[PDB]
Amino acid sequence: TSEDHFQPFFNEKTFGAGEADCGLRPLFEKKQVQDQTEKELFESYIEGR
């Protein structure tokens, strides 16, 4: 998909920290673990109907 990294839109000086690592939950994404209902979301991307 991407090449270098994710999309850091805001300036760290005004925004603060966080953006670069955003969206990766430490107790799930970071540990290769899935929550009880994630599947249901991904499936809807393929379901179509």
């Binding site: 998909t1 991407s2 994710f6 999309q7 839109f9 805001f10 300036n11 000086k13 005004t14 925004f15 603060g16 920290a17 966080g18 953006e19 690592d21 955003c22 969206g23 990766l24 939950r25 430490p26 107790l27 799930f28 994404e29 929550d35 009880q36 209902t37 994630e38 249901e40 979301l41 991904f42 809807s44 991307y45 379901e47 179509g48 109907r49």
Partner: protein, 259 residues
């Protein structure tokens, strides 16, 4: 949140709780977008028809929670607001158009396993993911039912609730309400007869509507709970602020400051 299920611990590292100082009450939900900024629905802070107009002194923020009442000493963080920013073109008298507000924390919080920011969508993600039928996730500590205290199933949840819902087709959204929908809002939910239920409800405004990108595996905030006609009514859907669309203002506010 109606017809939802209890969230797992740390399921939503970005869920924020807007707490009222006097009386000490749950106001709305919100979300952490960085170590110092929080995003909510402008109608939580300002709404003239209820004489509501809160200043940085009328409320605090509670980050890292799971239980809605108990002080969770081991994970919870409390903060005060430095500056509140409400979209200038916020229309509360007509249809809650541009229902959005940014809040700046007095001091940057320390992120942890339970406190982590959600991402804001970009052009590609907005485009690829915002398709009718695709599902997002809503979380909040709002009522699990419509009217106050009715059956054995008491109204307020003990812990954070979760529910996954489908983005609905704009024509269907419009046909559902007698209100003037706009482009700065979207609707989600199940159609009647589908036999699947679920919706946001009182106490949930400001909370995030997220989706997980299948390309980079991250979570993006696409919506903000805003309004609806009742909670989980047949033929009715829930409306959320369109976050990606309003991203120009968010940037304006955050970046056009320090220099």
């Amino acid at each position: 949140i109606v017809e939802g299920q209890d969230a797992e611990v740390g399921l939503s590292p970005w869920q924020v709780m807007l707490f009222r100082k006097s009386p000490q009450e749950l106001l709305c939900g919100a979300s952490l977008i960085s170590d110092r900024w929080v995003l909510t629905a402008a109608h939580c802070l300002l709404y003239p028809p209820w004489d509501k107009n809160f200043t940085v002194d009328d409320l605090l923020v509670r980050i890292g929670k799971h239980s809605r009442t108990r002080y969770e000493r081991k994970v919870e963080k409390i903060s005060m607001l430095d500056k509140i920013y409400i979209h200038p073109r916020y229309n509360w008298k007509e249809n809650l158009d541009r229902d959005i507000a940014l809040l700046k924390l007095k001091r940057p919080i320390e992120l942890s396993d339970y406190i982590h920011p959600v991402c804001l969508p970009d052009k590609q993600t907005a485009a690829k993911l915002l398709h009718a039928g695709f599902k997002g996730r809503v979380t909040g500590w709002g009522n699990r039912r419509e009217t106050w205290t009715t059956s054995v199933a008491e109204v307020q949840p003990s812990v954070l609730q979760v529910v996954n819902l489908p983005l609905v087709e704009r024509p269907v959204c419009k046909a559902s309400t007698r209100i003037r929908i706009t482009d700065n809002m979207f609707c989600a939910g199940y159609k009647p007869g589908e036999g699947k239920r679920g919706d946001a409800c009182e106490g949930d405004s400001g909370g995030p509507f997220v989706m997980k990108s299948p390309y980079n595996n991250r979570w993006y905030q696409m919506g903000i709970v805003s309004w609806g006609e009742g909670c989980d009514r047949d033929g009715k859907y829930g409306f959320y602020t369109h976050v990606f669309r309003l991203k120009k203002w968010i940037q304006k506010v955050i970046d056009r400051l320090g220099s």
